[PDB]
Design an enzyme around this catalytic site. Structure first.
Site, mmCIF file in Angstrom:
data_model
loop_
_atom_site.group_PDB
_atom_site.id
_atom_site.type_symbol
_atom_site.label_atom_id
_atom_site.label_comp_id
_atom_site.label_asym_id
_atom_site.label_seq_id
_atom_site.Cartn_x
_atom_site.Cartn_y
_atom_site.Cartn_z
ATOM 1 N N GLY A 197 3.091 10.236 34.221
ATOM 2 C CA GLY A 197 3.282 11.817 34.086
ATOM 3 C C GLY A 197 4.410 12.095 32.982
ATOM 4 O O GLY A 197 5.339 11.232 32.816
ATOM 5 N N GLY B 163 8.371 18.184 30.383
ATOM 6 C CA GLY B 163 9.404 18.657 29.173
ATOM 7 C C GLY B 163 10.684 18.138 29.349
ATOM 8 O O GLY B 163 11.380 18.260 28.280
ATOM 9 N N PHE B 164 11.046 17.822 30.535
ATOM 10 C CA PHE B 164 12.284 17.184 30.993
ATOM 11 C C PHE B 164 12.548 15.773 31.366
ATOM 12 O O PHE B 164 13.535 15.235 31.276
ATOM 13 C CB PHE B 164 12.940 17.956 32.211
ATOM 14 C CG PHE B 164 13.398 19.446 31.823
ATOM 15 C CD1 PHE B 164 14.483 19.901 31.102
ATOM 16 C CD2 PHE B 164 12.519 20.576 31.928
ATOM 17 C CE1 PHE B 164 14.966 21.316 31.025
ATOM 18 C CE2 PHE B 164 12.692 21.727 31.901
ATOM 19 C CZ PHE B 164 14.057 22.152 31.128
ATOM 20 N N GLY B 165 11.417 15.151 31.400
ATOM 21 C CA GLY B 165 11.494 13.610 31.733
ATOM 22 C C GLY B 165 9.985 12.957 31.812
ATOM 23 O O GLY B 165 9.046 13.680 31.510
ATOM 24 N N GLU B 166 10.004 11.890 32.536
ATOM 25 C CA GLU B 166 8.678 11.075 32.738
ATOM 26 C C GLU B 166 8.651 10.462 34.099
ATOM 27 O O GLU B 166 9.708 10.278 34.377
ATOM 28 C CB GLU B 166 8.564 10.296 31.568
ATOM 29 C CG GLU B 166 8.404 10.630 30.221
ATOM 30 C CD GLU B 166 9.471 10.952 29.536
ATOM 31 O OE1 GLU B 166 9.369 11.966 28.777
ATOM 32 O OE2 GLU B 166 10.352 10.092 29.735
ATOM 33 N N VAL B 167 7.340 10.350 34.355
ATOM 34 C CA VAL B 167 7.429 9.654 35.785
ATOM 35 C C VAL B 167 6.817 8.362 35.497
ATOM 36 O O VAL B 167 5.682 8.111 34.645
ATOM 37 C CB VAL B 167 6.588 10.449 36.779
ATOM 38 C CG1 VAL B 167 6.574 9.791 38.119
ATOM 39 C CG2 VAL B 167 7.195 11.578 37.072
ATOM 40 N N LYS C 95 10.610 9.195 38.982
ATOM 41 C CA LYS C 95 10.924 10.334 37.957
ATOM 42 C C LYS C 95 12.130 10.488 37.221
ATOM 43 O O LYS C 95 13.336 10.451 38.084
ATOM 44 C CB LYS C 95 10.647 11.733 38.869
ATOM 45 C CG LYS C 95 10.771 12.970 38.094
ATOM 46 C CD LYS C 95 10.460 14.082 39.160
ATOM 47 C CE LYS C 95 10.446 15.422 38.468
ATOM 48 N NZ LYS C 95 10.255 16.505 39.277
ATOM 49 N N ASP D 148 6.023 27.370 43.825
ATOM 50 C CA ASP D 148 5.446 26.830 42.608
ATOM 51 C C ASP D 148 4.121 26.180 42.837
ATOM 52 O O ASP D 148 3.681 25.478 42.029
ATOM 53 C CB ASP D 148 6.204 25.933 41.813
ATOM 54 C CG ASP D 148 5.967 25.782 40.156
ATOM 55 O OD1 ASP D 148 5.274 26.762 39.855
ATOM 56 O OD2 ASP D 148 6.646 24.845 39.937
#
Ligand SMILES: O=C(NCc1[nH]nc2ccccc12)c1cc([C@@H]2CCNC[C@H]2COc2ccc3c(c2)OCO3)ccc1F
Ligand SMILES: [Mg+2]
EC number: 2.7.11.15
Lengths: 58, 631, 339
Positions: free
Chosen positions: B169, B172-176, B191, B288
Site C-alpha cells: 500500500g 500520500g503520507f506513508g506506505e504499508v 503502516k 470516510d
C-alpha cells in the site's frame, strides 16, 4: 484525672516514705570496703599474668 | 530473537505490582487469554475440586459455537446427562435450583438456543472465584502468569523487531508493508507514516486520532475492520502494526474488474455492514467510507481501514464536513449541523452505487467540480436505473434518504435495520460473520500495485524537538491482541521450554543447597548494581528489601553487603546510557545506582524503596535507642 | 475535693521523702574515699575484634561461662560468638528486623531478643538435631521491647516502651507479673545478684527498684535531667549506676535511698548508652555517643581511662563474670574485646 489513680500514687509514696534509711557515711564506707575486699580478684585492677589471661597469646 | 521468560523469582515483584493495580482478582485474570489458559491448566491438572467446573465451562463454551440447531440438540442432551444429571445423582452439583430448572425446561420443550447454559456460566464463575482462585494464586501457574505478564508489560518495539517485506500500500503520507514479527512469527502489516509529510500538511492530530480510534476498535476481534496490535514510532516514522491485507483495495479492483453485479456487491455490502455495526457499537463513525478504504485479504474478504477520520460520539456529536466528495451525507456537508452514524449509511449507499455503476451517484458525468457533487448531493435525489432490481432499489432508497428521519439504519435499530432489508433476504448473517460466503474477487497471488492512492503527485523539513513530544504517548500495545498472538504461536512451546529449564535449575539447587522466608522481607529479586562507572562494572545480585534495609547477595554466597533505610536520603529515576535506572542518595554524599531488567521491576522497586525508607525513618525517629541524637 | 486532697497529699509525701533523704546525708562518698589511693591510668588494648554484623550493633550480653556472648544487630540477626577464637558459634536470623536488645540465659541454653515487634523471642540453643529454633514468643507489651534478662531457664524479666516491665513464665508464656509505675519508656533493666530485686531506668529521668516476687516498686530515684538509657547493679547489690542523655553517670545507694555520685566531665556533652562495673566494682565503664568508652573510678569519680577503638557510637558494653575482659559493641558493626 482518676481518683483511684491518685489513691494508688499516694499509697506508693507512703510505701517509698516509710522505709528505714542509713546514713550516707555508712553506705559509702560499706561500698569502699567491698571494693577493697575484692580488689585482688579484679583482673582489670590488678593485672593478671599473660599466662592466666585467655585473651593474650593462648 | 525469541521470547525469553524471566525466572520465577519475578513473582515477588510482579505479584505486588499487579496487586497495586487491583489486577490479581478473578475477573481480571480469567478474562485474559493467557490468564484463562494458565488458570484452566491449573484446575484441570493440579486440582481435583475444580476440574469438573472448568470442564463444564469449556463444554458450554464449545456448545455456544455450534452453528446448527441439530448439533445443539445433541450437545445439550450430552451436557445435561454428563455434567448436570450425574452431578445431581451424586448430590455434588453446586448450582441453584433456577439454573437446573431453566436448562431442563428448555430441554423438555426441545428449545436449544446457543445461550442455553448462561446461568451455569454465571454460577460456575461464582464457584471458581474464591478458594479455588486463591489456591491458583498460591500455585506456580500464577507464577508463570506473572512471568508472561512481565514479558507483556516490558514490550518495547522497534523496526528491528520486524522482518519487513514487500509494499502492499502507498499513500500520500506513508506506505504499508507486509512484515513478520520475529519473536512469534506472526504476519502483520506495518503502516509507516512520515513525520515530515505530517508536518508539511499539519496532520499530527489526524495521526494521533487514528491511533486513538484504532485502540477503541481493536478489541473483540472484528473480522471486518483492520485492527491494531501495536503502535510505535522512530525519529522519522509512525508505525501501526495492523491486520495483514495484501489483496489490494476496492478502488483498484473496481478499476480492474469493472462494475460488480448485485450479487457480487451484496457480499462486500454485508461485510462492510458488520464492520460498521462493530464501530457503531463502540460509538465510532467512520465518515470516510469509500472503495479506496475497503481492503481485500489473500482470499477476497474485505475490511475497513484507515480510521484517521473517525471520531467518538459517545459524548459530543460532530458537525464538520469530513469525508470524500461523493460519499458525504447531506447533514455532513451542512457545517453547524450535528450528526452521528447516519453519515456512514449514506456513504454505504454511495459506495454500493459506485460498485454497481462505476461512479458515485452524485458525480454523473465525470465532473470533477467538487461543488457540483455537493450541489447534487444536497438537493436532488438519485435516479436509480431500470437495470436495478426492486429489492436493491429499496435498499439504496432507504440508505440514500437525504433526511435522517427516513434514512435506513438511522431509525433506532442501527445496522440491524439494514440487515432486515429485502436485499439481504438470502443471507444468514452468522455465516457472513464467520466469513463463509465465497468472495466474488480473489486477488492473484503476489501481484503488484493493488493499493495506491489515486493521487501520486515531494519535499522535506527538519523535525523539531517539540514535535517528538507531540508523539510521546504514541507507543501502545493492545493486551488482548498480544495475548492472542502469543497464544496461537509460541505459548505452549515456550511454557514447555521454561518448565524444563526451571526443573534443571531445581536439580542444581537441590544438589548445591530460602533466605526470604520466615522473616519480614518486603520484596526480593534480581537487580544490577554499578561498581566502577568507567569499567562498565555492572554486577547482577539478588536483592532483599526488609523494612529497615536492602541486602544483596551473589550466586554462591550469603548476603555480605546491605544498605540501611536510614542512610537513604532520596530515590530517583535517572537515565544512564539511554537506560532507565535508579539513583539512591546516601547519607554522607555517596550514590548507589541500580538497574532493573524490566519496566515493572523498575517502577515497583522505586515505589517500595521510597515507601520503605520514608516509613523506616519516621519509625526510627520515634525510638530513643535507634534515633540519631545531637553530637 | 478528693482528687485535690490526693494531689496535695502526694506533694506532702514527696517533701517528706526528700527531707528524710537529706536527714541521711551526713557526708559524701567523695569525702569517705578521699583517703584511698587513686587507681591510676587504666590502659586496655583490643585482644579480639568480632567481625560479622552488617549494620549497627544495638546490644550484647555475656554468657555466664565468661567466653560466649550474644549480640543483636540492625542486620536483623543475633550472633553468638566464641570470644576466645572469634568464631561465630551461631548466626540466628530473626523474624523481625527491628531488634533492639538481647540476653544470654545463665545456663547458656537459651537466648532472648526483641524490639519494635513488641515481643520477647526465646531461642533454644540445643534442639534435637542441634539447630536454633524459636522456642517461645512472649507477647503482651503494647510497646517496643527495650531490654530483657533471664532469671533462670523458666522466668524472664522484660522492659518496654509502654512504660512497664514484666515477669514472664517461659513455659506457659504468661505475664506472671506487671511492674507499672514509670511515666515514660523504660530503656534498661538490671537484675540484682540474688535476682529478688531489679532496677529499671526510663525516659522519665527516674530509676526504680522493684521486688520481683512481690511485684511492687520499692524505691524511686531521681536526679538525672534526661532519659536514663542504661542501668547496672553494683556487684554487691546495694547500689546501682545509671547512664543518661544528660552526659552523666550516677551512682545511687539503696539503703541510703539517694544519689551518691555523679561521673561527668566538662568535655563530655554526649549521652551514655551503656554502663557496667568491673568485677570488684571499683571501675565503672560507660559507653558514649562520641565513639568512646570511659572507665571511671567508682569511688573517687575521676576518669581513669578511655577505650577508643570504634568509628561510631558505642551502643553497648559488658564485663565478664570473671572480670577478665570487657566487650564493647558499636554502631560501626564491630564488637571489640578489651583488657
Ligand atoms: O497515507 C495514507 N493514508 C492517509 C493517512 N493515514 N494516516 C494518516 C495520518 C495523518 C495524515 C494522513 C494519514 C496511506 C494510504 C494507503 C492505502 C492507499 C489506498 N487506499 C487504502 C490505503 C490503505 O492501504 C493499506 C494497504 C494494506 C494494508 C493496510 C492499508 O492495512 C492493512 O494492510 C497506504 C499507505 C498510506 F500511508
Ligand atoms: Mg454537518
Amino acid at each position: 484525672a482518676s481518683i483511684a489513680q491518685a489513691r494508688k500514687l499516694v499509697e506508693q509514696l507512703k510505701m517509698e516514705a516509710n522505709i528505714d534509711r542509713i546514713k550516707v557515711s555508712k553506705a559509702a564506707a560499706d561500698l569502699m570496703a567491698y571494693c577493697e575486699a575484692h580488689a585482688k580478684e579484679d583482673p582489670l585492677l590488678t593485672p593478671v599474668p599473660a599466662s592466666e589471661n585467655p585473651f593474650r597469646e593462648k | 530473537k525469541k521470547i525469553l521468560l524471566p525466572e520465577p523469582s519475578i513473582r515477588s515483584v510482579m505479584q505486588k505490582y499487579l496487586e497495586d493495580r487491583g489486577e490479581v482478582t478473578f475477573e481480571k485474570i480469567f478474562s485474559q487469554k493467557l490468564g484463562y489458559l494458565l488458570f484452566r491448566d491449573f484446575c484441570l491438572n493440579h486440582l481435583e475440586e475444580a476440574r469438573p467446573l472448568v470442564e463444564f465451562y469449556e463444554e458450554i463454551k464449545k456448545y455456544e459455537k455450534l452453528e446448527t440447531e441439530e448439533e445443539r440438540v445433541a450437545r445439550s442432551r450430552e451436557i445435561f446427562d454428563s455434567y448436570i444429571m450425574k452431578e445431581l445423582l451424586a448430590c455434588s452439583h453446586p448450582f441453584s435450583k433456577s439454573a437446573t430448572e431453566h436448562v431442563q425446561g428448555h430441554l423438555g420443550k426441545k428449545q436449544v438456543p446457543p445461550d442455553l447454559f448462561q446461568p451455569y456460566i454465571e454460577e460456575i464463575c461464582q464457584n471458581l472465584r474464591g478458594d479455588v482462585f486463591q489456591k491458583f494464586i498460591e500455585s506456580d501457574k500464577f507464577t508463570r502468569f506473572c512471568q508472561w505478564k512481565n514479558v507483556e508489560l516490558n514490550i518495547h518495539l522497534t523496526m528491528n523487531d520486524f522482518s519487513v517485506h514487500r509494499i502492499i500500500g502507498r499513500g500520500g503520507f506513508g506506505e504499508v508493508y507486509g512484515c513478520r514479527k520475529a519473536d512469534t512469527g506472526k504476519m502483520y502489516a506495518m503502516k509507516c507514516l512520515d513525520k515530515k509529510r505530517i508536518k508539511m500538511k499539519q496532520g499530527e492530530t489526524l495521526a494521533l486520532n487514528e491511533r486513538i480510534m484504532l485502540s477503541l476498535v481493536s478489541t473483540g476481534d472484528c473480522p471486518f475492520i483492520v485492527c491494531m496490535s501495536y503502535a510505535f514510532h522512530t525519529p522519522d516514522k509512525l508505525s501501526f502494526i495492523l491486520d495483514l491485507m495484501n489483496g489490494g483495495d476496492l478502488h483498484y479492483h473496481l478499476s480492474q474488474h469493472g462494475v460488480f453485479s448485485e450479487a457480487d456487491m451484496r457480499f462486500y455490502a454485508a461485510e462492510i455492514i458488520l464492520g460498521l455495526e462493530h464501530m457503531h457499537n463502540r460509538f465510532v463513525v467512520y465518515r470516510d467510507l469509500k472503495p479506496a478504504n475497503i481492503l481485500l485479504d489473500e482470499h477476497g474478504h474485505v475490511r475497513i481501514s484507515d480510521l484517521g477520520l473517525a471520531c467518538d460520539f459517545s459524548k459530543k456529536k460532530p458537525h464538520a464536513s469530513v469525508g470524500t466528495h461523493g460519499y458525504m451525507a447531506p447533514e455532513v456537508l451542512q457545517k453547524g449541523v450535528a450528526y452521528d452514524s447516519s453519515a456512514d449509511w449514506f456513504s454505504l449507499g454511495c459506495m454500493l452505487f459506485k460498485l454497481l455503476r462505476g461512479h458515485s451517484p452524485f458525480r454523473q458525468h465525470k465532473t470533477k467540480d467538487k461543488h457540483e457533487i455537493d450541489r447534487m448531493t444536497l438537493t436532488m435525489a438519485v435516479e436509480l436505473p431500470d437495470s436495478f432490481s426492486p429489492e436493491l432499489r429499496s435498499l439504496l432508497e432507504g440508505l440514500l434518504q437525504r433526511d435522517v428521519n427516513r434514512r435506513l439504519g438511522c431509525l433506532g435499530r442501527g445496522a440491524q435495520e439494514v440487515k432486515e432489508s429485502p436485499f439481504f433476504r438470502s443471507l444468514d448473517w452468522q455465516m457472513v460473520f464467520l466469513q463463509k460466503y465465497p468472495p466474488p474477487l480473489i486477488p492473484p497471488r503476489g501481484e503488484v500495485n493493488a493499493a495506491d492512492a489515486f493521487d501520486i503527485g515531494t519535499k522535506g523539513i527538519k523535525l523539531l524537538d517539540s514535535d517528538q513530544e507531540l508523539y510521546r504517548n504514541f507507543p501502545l500495545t493492545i493486551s488482548e491482541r498480544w495475548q492472542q498472538e502469543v497464544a496461537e504461536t509460541v505459548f505452549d512451546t515456550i511454557n514447555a521450554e521454561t518448565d524444563r529449564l526451571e526443573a534443571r535449575k531445581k536439580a542444581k539447587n537441590k544438589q548445591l543447597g530460602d533466605y526470604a522466608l520466615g522473616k519480614d522481607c518486603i520484596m526480593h529479586g534480581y537487580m544490577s548494581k554499578m561498581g566502577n562507572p568507567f569499567l562498565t562494572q555492572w554486577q547482577r545480585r539478588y536483592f532483599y528489601l526488609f523494612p529497615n534495609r536492602l541486602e544483596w547477595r551473589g550466586e554462591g554466597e550469603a548476603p555480605q553487603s546491605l544498605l540501611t533505610m536510614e542512610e537513604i536520603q532520596s530515590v530517583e529515576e535517572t537515565q544512564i546510557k539511554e537506560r532507565k535506572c535508579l539513583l539512591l542518595k546516601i547519607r554522607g554524599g555517596k550514590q548507589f545506582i541500580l538497574q532493573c531488567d524490566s519496566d515493572p521491576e523498575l517502577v515497583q522497586w522505586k515505589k517500595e524503596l521510597r515507601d520503605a525508607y520514608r516509613e523506616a525513618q519516621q519509625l526510627v525517629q520515634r525510638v530513643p535507642k535507634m534515633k540519631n541524637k545531637p553530637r | 475535693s478528693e482528687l485535690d486532697q490526693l494531689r496535695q497529699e502526694a506533694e506532702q509525701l514527696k517533701n517528706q521523702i526528700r527531707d528524710a533523704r537529706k536527714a541521711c546525708a551526713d557526708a559524701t562518698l567523695s569525702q569517705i574515699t578521699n583517703n584511698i589511693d587513686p587507681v591510676g591510668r587504666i590502659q586496655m588494648r583490643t585482644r579480639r575484634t568480632l567481625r560479622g554484623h552488617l549494620a549497627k550493633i544495638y546490644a550484647m550480653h555475656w554468657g555466664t561461662d565468661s567466653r560466649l556472648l550474644v549480640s543483636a544487630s540492625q542486620d536483623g540477626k543475633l550472633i553468638i560468638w566464641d570470644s576466645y577464637t572469634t568464631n561465630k558459634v551461631h548466626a540466628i536470623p530473626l523474624r523481625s528486623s527491628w531488634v533492639m536488645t538481647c540476653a544470654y540465659a545463665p545456663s547458656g541454653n537459651y537466648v532472648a531478643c526483641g524490639g519494635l515487634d513488641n515481643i520477647c523471642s526465646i531461642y533454644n540453643l540445643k534442639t534435637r538435631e542441634g539447630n536454633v529454633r524459636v522456642s517461645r514468643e512472649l507477647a503482651g507489651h503494647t510497646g517496643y521491647l527495650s531490654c530483657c534478662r533471664f532469671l533462670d531457664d523458666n522466668q524472664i524479666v522484660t522492659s518496654s516502651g509502654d512504660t512497664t516491665c514484666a515477669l514472664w513464665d517461659i513455659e506457659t508464656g504468661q505475664q506472671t507479673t506487671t511492674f507499672t509505675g514509670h511515666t515514660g519508656d523504660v530503656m534498661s533493666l538490671s537484675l540484682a545478684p540474688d535476682t529478688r530485686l531489679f532496677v529499671s531506668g526510663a525516659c522519665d529521668a527516674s530509676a526504680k527498684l522493684w521486688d520481683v516476687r512481690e511485684g511492687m516498686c520499692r524505691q524511686t530515684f531521681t536526679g538525672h535531667e534526661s532519659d536514663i538509657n542504661a542501668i547496672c547493679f553494683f556487684p554487691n547489690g546495694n547500689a546501682f549506676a545509671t547512664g543518661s542523655d544528660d552526659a552523666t553517670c550516677r551512682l545511687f545507694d539503696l539503703r541510703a535511698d539517694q544519689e551518691l555520685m555523679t561521673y561527668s566531665h566538662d568535655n563530655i556533652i554526649c549521652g551514655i548508652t551503656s554502663v557496667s562495673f568491673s568485677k570488684s566494682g571499683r571501675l565503672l565503664l560507660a559507653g558514649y555517643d562520641d565513639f568512646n568508652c570511659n572507665v571511671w573510678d567508682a569511688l573517687k569519680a575521676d576518669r581513669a581511662g578511655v577505650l577508643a577503638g570504634h568509628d561510631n557510637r558505642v551502643s553497648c558494653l559488658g564485663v565478664t563474670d570473671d572480670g577478665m575482659a570487657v566487650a564493647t559493641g558499636s554502631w560501626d558493626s564491630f564488637l571489640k574485646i578489651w583488657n
